[PDB]
């Protein structure tokens, strides 16, 4: 579908989609939110996949 | 008054604010004591029902 | 040794502050396979000493800004973890409360950091002209945006009504004089209308010659003033086709302004007090507010 979106025009101009430096603040996470992330399914699945 | 209140306090024993970490208020033990009256100026006195 | 590869890439990033491509690393260190270079880059990103740029030439790796330091008291990590979104906001600035929410830190934490950063000339705090609430913070080198602060009209967070009034008066007088001269010329209606027309660049040059105020007025500033005069119903603008000339502002188009008379005199409705009465809704035949005892007609007939 992304390819189809890009295929609207037969020739696509070289996009000036330079990835602006969106280096995000490593926000100090509230301990409640850190516990929520630890208990999140994605975190457990990533930990399983680490092995 | 002999068991449940201690369980409730243990559930909420530590309270702290997000602002200024390393500051906390920790409950250790809770007592209800004997019935008393606050009529006496900053002094308690045993009172019958 | 991957540690040696990481150190060499760090040295290369030091040599090129603008960032290095994979080609530069490969040319500098040719005996190392591409997989080892990719692993080293990934580790360097994992510990956060590098940032990735996507340019039209490909991927660039740049060292994270740590040498540029304004708040070294405490930790360099939080110093850069404030300067980072300070730079991200950039020319538009950022309010202190917004900074606190973006850095997820208490007010005192960011307070000390902001004072220290301003001490080492890393961030400049300017007063928000658009909504005078809090002081926005920008990079010291970055030029402040004319929208978020400053502007030829705003002087110390104050709109200049006198300045815009004088600008309107002078521009309208110039346009009216030009139209009067064009009418008196009576050489030919086409030439009369064309000479009555005044270019935005021409009136801007005339205003600069007048030099009423010290602040430099750009061409689009006078264009906005003339647009306000248009909205006042006193001047008329037409966009004509001119490929290039002394103006050269809009591609193939130039805006010509001429003072124009109003369509009609004031209507008959406003010549009666009831047409201008503010309590017209409450006016009634028999009541407190009645035309028989109306004060407005009393003053109007007495006058
Ligand atoms: S009669 Fe007097 S109050 Fe009523 S609309 Fe006319 S001016 Fe206004």
Swiss-Prot record, chain A:
Crosslink feature (Glycyl lysine isopeptide (Lys-Gly) (interchain with G-Cter in SUMO2)) location: 19
Chain segments annotated as coiled-coil in the UniProt record: none
Residues with PTM Phosphoserine: 9-10, 40
Annotated spans, Disordered: 1-18
Subcellular location: Nucleus
The organism's place on the tree of life at top rank: Eukaryota
Function: DNA-dependent RNA polymerase catalyzes the transcription of DNA into RNA using the four ribonucleoside triphosphates as substrates. Specific peripheric component of RNA polymerase III (Pol III) which synthesizes small non-coding RNAs including 5S rRNA, snRNAs, tRNAs and miRNAs from at least 500 distinct genomic loci. Assembles with POLR3D/RPC4 forming a subcomplex that binds the Pol III core. Enables recruitment of Pol III at transcription initiation site and drives transcription initiation from both type 2 and type 3 DNA promoters.
Quaternary context: Component of the RNA polymerase III complex consisting of at least 17 subunits: a ten-subunit horseshoe-shaped catalytic core composed of POLR3A/RPC1, POLR3B/RPC2, POLR1C/RPAC1, POLR1D/RPAC2, POLR3K/RPC10, POLR2E/RPABC1, POLR2F/RPABC2, POLR2H/RPABC3, POLR2K/RPABC4 and POLR2L/RPABC5; the stalk composed of two subunits POLR3H/RPC8 and CRCP/RPC9, forming a structural mobile part that protrudes out of the core and functions primarily in transcription initiation; and additional subunits homologous to general transcription factors of the RNA polymerase II machinery, POLR3D/RPC4-POLR3E/RPC5 heterodimer and POLR3/CRPC3-POLR3F/RPC6-POLR3G/RPC7 heterotrimer.
Protein name as annotated: DNA-directed RNA polymerase III subunit RPC5
Species assigned in the record: Homo sapiens
Gene: POLR3E
Included stretch of the parent chain: 153 to 203 of 708
Swiss-Prot record, chain B:
Cellular localisation: Nucleus; Cytoplasm, Cytosol
Entry coiled-coil feature ranges: none
Biological role: Catalytic core component of RNA polymerase III (Pol III), a DNA-dependent RNA polymerase which synthesizes small non-coding RNAs using the four ribonucleoside triphosphates as substrates. Synthesizes 5S rRNA, snRNAs, tRNAs and miRNAs from at least 500 distinct genomic loci. Pol III-mediated transcription cycle proceeds through transcription initiation, transcription elongation and transcription termination stages. During transcription initiation, Pol III is recruited to DNA promoters type I, II or III with the help of general transcription factors and other specific initiation factors.
Family statement drawn from the similarity comment of this UniProt entry: Belongs to the RNA polymerase beta chain family.
Record's disease association: Leukodystrophy, hypomyelinating, 8, with or without oligodontia and/or hypogonadotropic hypogonadism: An autosomal recessive neurodegenerative disorder characterized by early childhood onset of cerebellar ataxia and mild intellectual disabilities associated with diffuse hypomyelination apparent on brain MRI. Variable features include oligodontia and/or hypogonadotropic hypogonadism. Charcot-Marie-Tooth disease, demyelinating, type 1I: An autosomal dominant demyelinating form of Charcot-Marie-Tooth disease, a disorder of the peripheral nervous system, characterized by progressive weakness and atrophy, initially of the peroneal muscles and later of the distal muscles of the arms. Charcot-Marie-Tooth disease is classified in two main groups on the basis of electrophysiologic properties and histopathology: primary peripheral demyelinating neuropathies (designated CMT1 when they are dominantly inherited) and primary peripheral axonal neuropathies (CMT2).
Gene that specifies this protein: POLR3B
Residues of the full protein shown: 51 to 99 of 1133
From Swiss-Prot, chain C:
Main location: nucleus
Gene: POLR3F
Record organism: Homo sapiens
Compartments in which it is found: Nucleus
Disease: Immunodeficiency 101, varicella zoster virus-specific: An autosomal dominant immunologic disorder characterized by reactivation of varicella zoster virus (VZV) infection in adulthood after primary childhood infection with VZV. The viral reactivation manifests as central nervous system vasculitis with stroke-like episodes and lacunar infarcts on brain imaging. Features include headache, hemiparesis, impaired balance, and other neurologic signs.
Binding site for [4Fe-4S] cluster: 274, 277, 283, 294
The record's note on its domains: The [4FE-4S] cluster-binding domain adopts a globular structure that serves as an interaction hub that connects the POLR3C/RPC3-POLR3F/RPC6-POLR3G/RPC7 heterotrimer to the Pol III core.
Family of the protein in this entry: Belongs to the eukaryotic RPC34/RPC39 RNA polymerase subunit family.
Residues forming coiled coils: none
Annotated GO MF terms: 4 iron, 4 sulfur cluster binding; DNA-directed RNA polymerase activity; double-stranded DNA binding
Protein name: DNA-directed RNA polymerase III subunit RPC6
Annotated function: DNA-dependent RNA polymerase catalyzes the transcription of DNA into RNA using the four ribonucleoside triphosphates as substrates. Specific peripheric component of RNA polymerase III (Pol III) which synthesizes small non-coding RNAs including 5S rRNA, snRNAs, tRNAs and miRNAs from at least 500 distinct genomic loci. Part of POLR3C/RPC3-POLR3F/RPC6-POLR3G/RPC7 heterotrimer that coordinates the dynamics of Pol III stalk and clamp modules during the transition from apo to elongation state.
Alphabetical GO biological process terms: defense response to virus; innate immune response; positive regulation of innate immune response; positive regulation of interferon-beta production; regulation of transcription by RNA polymerase III; transcription by RNA polymerase III
Pfam family, one: RNA_pol_Rpc34
